[PDB]
Write a protein that binds this ligand. Sequence first.
Ligand code: 6NT
Length: 305
Amino acid sequence: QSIDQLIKARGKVYFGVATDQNRLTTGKNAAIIKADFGMVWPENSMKWDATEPSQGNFNFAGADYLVNWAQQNGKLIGAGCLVWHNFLPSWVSSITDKNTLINVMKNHITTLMTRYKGKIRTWDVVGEAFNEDGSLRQNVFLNVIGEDYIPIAFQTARAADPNAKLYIMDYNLDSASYPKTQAIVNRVKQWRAAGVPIDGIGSQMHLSAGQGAGVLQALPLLASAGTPEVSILMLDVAGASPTDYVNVVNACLNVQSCVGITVMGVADPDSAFASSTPLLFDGNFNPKPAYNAIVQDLQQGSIEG
Ligand SMILES: O=[N+]([O-])c1ccc2nn[nH]c2c1
């Protein structure tokens, strides 16, 4: 059974997966994605160091392949991350002039979003902007531009493609009592109050065993920022326990504004954390216990009021 179909039947938008051209042309990835997933994200091909490796020199072959494959196969597309300290070329992080960095950031945003205008459901505009203690991360953007870089990025994105849902994403938002979780909620509330167009918070859920249960409290806390959407991104779970995975899925189901879940890949050998066997399919492309547990969970209705 298809977990995407099953989650749609429970009123959600999608169950998605990260992929790219290499995956689609090897293994059984394309067959599994066609059958079982409803949204794709580029694993690597939309990163800044993939797409703009030197100034104004855009590389779109990989991203184009994924977007076209998704279109041809009737899948939604998410993409990102546009402004991120990760995977950022040294030509960017060496800029010291404020107006230059502002325009470099804006052109990166606008060029990527314009190319795919109208085709992308969700853009992750700003990623990993917070320190663990909840203060803003001192990346090049914060150091050179200051905290206005976040509002500027979102407004620029809204202008470039008003159809897209614009997200901020971060990791270690998996515990309701952790400082980072409350801090992103607080900052997003105040950005939105000031007119900054943040449509979603995406929680990047690279989990260790046993962390699924806590998401049942963290995800509702994230939703309390009042964004129209929240989502689960980059999901994998060390050990791939059915209990962890079912708890994450149920957190999504419990949170009205949660639109869906994206897993970080299809099969274990293709994970960056392969030795932790953290995905839903094994090295034979058979569904693992966790996949089947999710299927059982989604088939079984809850008693609603
Ligand atoms: O959910 N995802 O797996 C995922 C992968 C790569 C991304 N880049 N920006 N957002 C992303 C989400």
